[PDB]
Amino acid sequence: TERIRNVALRSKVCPAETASELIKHGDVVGTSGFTGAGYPKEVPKALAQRMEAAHDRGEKYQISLITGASTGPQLDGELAKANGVYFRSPFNTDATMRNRINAGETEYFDNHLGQVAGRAVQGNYGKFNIALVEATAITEDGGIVPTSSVGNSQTFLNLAEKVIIEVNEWQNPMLEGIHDIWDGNVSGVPTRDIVPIVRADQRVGGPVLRVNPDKIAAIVRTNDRDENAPFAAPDETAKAIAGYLLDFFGHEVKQNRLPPSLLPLQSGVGNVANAVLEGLKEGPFENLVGYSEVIQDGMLAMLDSGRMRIASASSFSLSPEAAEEINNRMDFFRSKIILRQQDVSNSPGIIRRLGCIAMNGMIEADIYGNVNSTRVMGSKMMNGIGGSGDFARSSYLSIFLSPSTAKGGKISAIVPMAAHVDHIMQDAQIFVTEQGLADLRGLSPVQRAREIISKCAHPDYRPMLQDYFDRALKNSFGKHTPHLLTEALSWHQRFIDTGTMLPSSLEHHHHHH
Amino acid sequence: TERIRNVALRSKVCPAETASELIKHGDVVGTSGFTGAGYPKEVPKALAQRMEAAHDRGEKYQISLITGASTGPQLDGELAKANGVYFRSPFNTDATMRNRINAGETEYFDNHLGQVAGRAVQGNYGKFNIALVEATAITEDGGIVPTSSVGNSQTFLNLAEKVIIEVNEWQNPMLEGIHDIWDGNVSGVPTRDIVPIVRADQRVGGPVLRVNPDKIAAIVRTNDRDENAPFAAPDETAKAIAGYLLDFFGHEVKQNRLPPSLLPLQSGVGNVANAVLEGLKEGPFENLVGYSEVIQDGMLAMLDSGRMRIASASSFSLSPEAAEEINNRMDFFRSKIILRQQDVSNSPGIIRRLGCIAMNGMIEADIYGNVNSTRVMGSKMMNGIGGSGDFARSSYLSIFLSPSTAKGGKISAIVPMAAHVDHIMQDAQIFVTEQGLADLRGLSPVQRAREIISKCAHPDYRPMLQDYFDRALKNSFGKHTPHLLTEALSWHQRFIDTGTMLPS
Numbered sequence A: 001t002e003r004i005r006n007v008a009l010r011s012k013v014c015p016a017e018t019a020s021e022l023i024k025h026g027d028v029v030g031t032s033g034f035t036g037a038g039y040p041k042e043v044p045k046a047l048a049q050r051m052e053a054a055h056d057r058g059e060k061y062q063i064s065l066i067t068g069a070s071t072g073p074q075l076d077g078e079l080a081k082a083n084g085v086y087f088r089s090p091f092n093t094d095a096t097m098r099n100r101i102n103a104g105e106t107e108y109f110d111n112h113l114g115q116v117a118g119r120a121v122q123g124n125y126g127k128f129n130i131a132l133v134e135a136t137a138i139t140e141d142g143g144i145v146p147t148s149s150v151g152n153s154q155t156f157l158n159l160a161e162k163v164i165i166e167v168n169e170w171q172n173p174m175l176e177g178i179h180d181i182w183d184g185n186v187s188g189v190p191t192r193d194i195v196p197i198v199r200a201d202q203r204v205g206g207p208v209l210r211v212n213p214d215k216i217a218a219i220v221r222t223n224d225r226d227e228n229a230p231f232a233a234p235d236e237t238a239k240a241i242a243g244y245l246l247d248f249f250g251h252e253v254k255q256n257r258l259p260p261s262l263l264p265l266q267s268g269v270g271n272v273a274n275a276v277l278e279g280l281k282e283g284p285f286e287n288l289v290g291y292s293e294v295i296q297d298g299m300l301a302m303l304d305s306g307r308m309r310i311a312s313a314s315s316f317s318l319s320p321e322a323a324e325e326i327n328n329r330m331d332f333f334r335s336k337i338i339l340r341q342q343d344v345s346n347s348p349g350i351i352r353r354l355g356c357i358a359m360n361g362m363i364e365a366d367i368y369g370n371v372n373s374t375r376v377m378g379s380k381m382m383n384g385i386g387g388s389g390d391f392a393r394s395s396y397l398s399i400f401l402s403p404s405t406a407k408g409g410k411i412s413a414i415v416p417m418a419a420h421v422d423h424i425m426q427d428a429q430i431f432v433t434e435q436g437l438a439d440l441r442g443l444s445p446v447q448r449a450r451e452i453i454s455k456c457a458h459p460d461y462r463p464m465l466q467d468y469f470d471r472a473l474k475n476s477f478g479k480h481t482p483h484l485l486t487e488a489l490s491w492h493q494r495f496i497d498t499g500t501m502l503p504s505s506l507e508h509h510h511h512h513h
Numbered sequence B: 001t002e003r004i005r006n007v008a009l010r011s012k013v014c015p016a017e018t019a020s021e022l023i024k025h026g027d028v029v030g031t032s033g034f035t036g037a038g039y040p041k042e043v044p045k046a047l048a049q050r051m052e053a054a055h056d057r058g059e060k061y062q063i064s065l066i067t068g069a070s071t072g073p074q075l076d077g078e079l080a081k082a083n084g085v086y087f088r089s090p091f092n093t094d095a096t097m098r099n100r101i102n103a104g105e106t107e108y109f110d111n112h113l114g115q116v117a118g119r120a121v122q123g124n125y126g127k128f129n130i131a132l133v134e135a136t137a138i139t140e141d142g143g144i145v146p147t148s149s150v151g152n153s154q155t156f157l158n159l160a161e162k163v164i165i166e167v168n169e170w171q172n173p174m175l176e177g178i179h180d181i182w183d184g185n186v187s188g189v190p191t192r193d194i195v196p197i198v199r200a201d202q203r204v205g206g207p208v209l210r211v212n213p214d215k216i217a218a219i220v221r222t223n224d225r226d227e228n229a230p231f232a233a234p235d236e237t238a239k240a241i242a243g244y245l246l247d248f249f250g251h252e253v254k255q256n257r258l259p260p261s262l263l264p265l266q267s268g269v270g271n272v273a274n275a276v277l278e279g280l281k282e283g284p285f286e287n288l289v290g291y292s293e294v295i296q297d298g299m300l301a302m303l304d305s306g307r308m309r310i311a312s313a314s315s316f317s318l319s320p321e322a323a324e325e326i327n328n329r330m331d332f333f334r335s336k337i338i339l340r341q342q343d344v345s346n347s348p349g350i351i352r353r354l355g356c357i358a359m360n361g362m363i364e365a366d367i368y369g370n371v372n373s374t375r376v377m378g379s380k381m382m383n384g385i386g387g388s389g390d391f392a393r394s395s396y397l398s399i400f401l402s403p404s405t406a407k408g409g410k411i412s413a414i415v416p417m418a419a420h421v422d423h424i425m426q427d428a429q430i431f432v433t434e435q436g437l438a439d440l441r442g443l444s445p446v447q448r449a450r451e452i453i454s455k456c457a458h459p460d461y462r463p464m465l466q467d468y469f470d471r472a473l474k475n476s477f478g479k480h481t482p483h484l485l486t487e488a489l490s491w492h493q494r495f496i497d498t499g500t501m502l503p504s
């Protein structure tokens, strides 16, 4: 079946290489793409080759790359390999791009995901020269049907001088209808519109991205896969974390602080999130709802079982097996899933109104429960803040979950002071590790420390943490949030110097005595 | 005229001492009070005296005190003196209470102001035993007319098992009508209601707090004053800051990035705010609108002159001169001011919708533009985060303003690393000091550092900051946000050790 149903636009079809020539050195390029889903693939590959060829001749060729969130090897990977990106925002997971960022070869700012569209419209990234968007189909009236994510695509189409569409036949035609794109003012010039979502299953718009066809400079027919990461099977650490969390939810329900259907759930991807979703599938709940950034494998499983009634997201984040499952049953799943613009999925007004429960990962937390989501040792970017701030701050309950240690036990995920802060104490109420769960509601910082140290810290690090806290309480400049500035960041420096946060018995350490 | 207009409720009038006896050891007490305005006065004094007596007899007697925001000497002050508060939230400016907090004698958590009502309803502070609320009047239908703030009073009235009202004859009867109390679900059980505010001048509710009269256990007739703001004027540092900001607004308008009337303005309180508002009073931006937390002197002057058309807030914080001014022309000013529940004034959904410009003070920022609003050296509480996070993160533009130094030059307000973070880089776009203005929009952290160091840092500290940054770029673990962990907090330690951040 023909994917370009508007006949006039068929005249704009051309090869990926030709389309890539529209993108010039210095251009700001906005693309589709979120959690490895729905990013353009063939044009970036062609662009990267041409970039490398230019560089080899001493000719500069780089772009500014603004996305929904993370992309995949064909986009972030190829362009990073080519050293073709001078500025990148708002979120990346590609390892080559991460290296460019951490070497200072690519300038990076990880904006809150729900704010990116608004900042783009404000002009913070400059003038958009190109929007490069993957599509399932183009409708009779020239509507652009997105693929496996919506992201910021509508905003980029609005802002960009020229538009390139990749029509990807790998993407199931029955994605058409799964998206909800609003023409309302969510991220435009104030005063903005009320975004009138009052339930997670509510549609407010239509199935297509809208763009003036006169801005469409090229359409490329493609056939290539998303980046469907291998399923991260829960290990025992993940299962323990999920057990503590599920026990907590059960207790909240028994105390009438949550309904048996909980509240709309936001979760992440990977080991721990997978364990939580498996637990939710089998737990004493019913009629669950997702209002999140992503649809993951375990969410499909609950939609299938009926445990989850609907799932709202901006994107899919599926394994190859789950992608095949939904591909084979898209008629069923399309009725259970709504994919929204990320400025709507991550709208603080909506998140608060629905009372979402936010469940997010972390690099580390300090004893006072300030959270680092991004910068190892304070300086080395991992992925980016993503929507963790959108959700943590706006949520009814903000929960952070992590193994109590990292790097095979050589790093403590609970530290005297976080080396970088993404989520302040006020934005984190519950911490869960494989050691236990800290409920910090209504606690002062010193009370938070008592709970975090006792419930969440690993036995290998708890005495060290207690020692820091005890001496800080005796010596700190103020006693409201006790610190010893002489050693607050010393465990991080110890890791940098020695490869472990565990102290040597060849020197004096206060907790050894 | 009679302030208790409901005849039946007059039978509940009793002394402050007797009313204080309703409050028991361990109780959670929610009170009126925000920016030194509208907090209960006489019952807390009577309670404090009884607490001291009890402690002397060997009886425990402490409460959890949850407010709108800051109160005054009769409440935070007297209770702190009596060692009568085991937990305090969300915002304090009293020196005695600050000392209890910094000694570890009172537990404190400074929640985001717009979230306090919702957390109270969720149960985070425990069951509310008592709501203690100051009133201008009680209407014939039993409505409680708030005084100089709204704060969290409606939520506390809803939650509390027993209610005590202080009817304060010191408060101007013409305050009646200025408040806008919404009937809907802003901070209750999800799913919450949409608040239909789409303009800052929009009233969506009524003039009174509502409470079941059967929950009123005591009414106390009082006569005592709120706290006033200082009359003190903007010095040259503050005026320079205001000048840079006003020039920036002018350029934004010229580039069509702001309307000629700007956008709804949120302003913190202090010297810098006064200068900014004083600057705006004679500025080129007409038909201004305030959507803020507090009505300060500067706003009154603008409402007076007509440069500002309307101002929304939850509270007043006025100098005695400005208080005299408004109390003489209340009918005029009442038509230009709307006092809202703080969960509405500080609602991120509303703030973002309106596109507020947030202007807030700070203790310090680091070279990457993370901001500390609260904890000196990382550990010693000043006031609290207040609504600075509510507004900074939700705003159309988030602006932080500070002198480039503190303590007579012995502290740099720009440091290698903030000793505590309240506002992450993403939540701060513009920094202004008396040295200049740093526009950080669209910049990576290393690009932010170049702007902050070169535009905002004091000349005494700029080379030291540049030296730190340059060596960090060479030697840092990663180069995305370069740091030297061995010296990141060393300027703070240097201040602790020597009394100055400047080396010998």
Ligand SMILES: *SCCNC(=O)CCNC(=O)[C@H](O)C(C)(C)COP(=O)(O)OP(=O)(O)OC[C@H]1O[C@@H](n2cnc3c(N)ncnc32)[C@H](O)[C@@H]1OP(=O)(O)O
Pocket (backbone or CB within 6 Å): B267, B268, B269, B270, B271, B272, B273, B293, B294, B360, B361, B362, B363, B364, B373, B374, B376, B382, B383, B384, B385, B386, B387, B388, B391, B403, B405, B406, B407, B411, B412, B413
């Ligand atoms: S309604 C939404 C906004 N709410 C808030 O922003 C709440 C938190 N903000 C505040 O409490 C103030 O804005 C702070 C950050 C304290 C700044 O207040 P000012 O604008 O009035 O600035 P001042 O220069 O007058 O400083 C006031 C006191 O703070 C001390 N101080 C400032 N900076 C430092 C540093 N870097 N180090 C140590 N102390 C610092 C000043 O000394 C001053 O203290 P005093 O003892 O009262 O003189």
Ligand SMILES: CC(C)(COP(=O)(O)OP(=O)(O)OC[C@H]1O[C@@H](n2cnc3c(N)ncnc32)[C@H](O)[C@@H]1OP(=O)(O)O)[C@@H](O)C(=O)NCCC(=O)NCCS
Pocket (backbone or CB within 6 Å): A267, A268, A269, A270, A271, A272, A293, A360, A361, A362, A363, A364, A372, A373, A374, A376, A382, A383, A384, A385, A386, A387, A388, A389, A403, A405, A406, A407, A411, A412, A413
């Ligand atoms: C913080 C975050 C990196 C944790 O990832 P995770 O998958 O949950 O858990 P992991 O334990 O596998 O950690 C991932 C990486 O961070 C590293 N890491 C985690 N904690 C660390 C620590 N305390 N110190 C050093 N490295 C750490 C791990 O080693 C791992 O690195 P690797 O890929 O080289 O092996 C991740 O949640 C994230 O990027 N968050 C930001 C975006 C976000 O939260 N969006 C919200 C909605 S999903």
Ligand SMILES: [Cl-]
Pocket (backbone or CB within 6 Å): A193, A194, A195, A196, A349, A350, B349, B353
């Ligand atoms: Cl809204």
Ligand SMILES: [Cl-]
Pocket (backbone or CB within 6 Å): A440, A441, A442, A443, B111, B119, B124
């Ligand atoms: Cl809390």
Ligand SMILES: [Cl-]
Pocket (backbone or CB within 6 Å): A349, B193, B194, B195, B196, B349, B350
């Ligand atoms: Cl709303």
Ligand SMILES: [Cl-]
Pocket (backbone or CB within 6 Å): A111, A119, A124, B440, B441, B442, B443
């Ligand atoms: Cl930005």
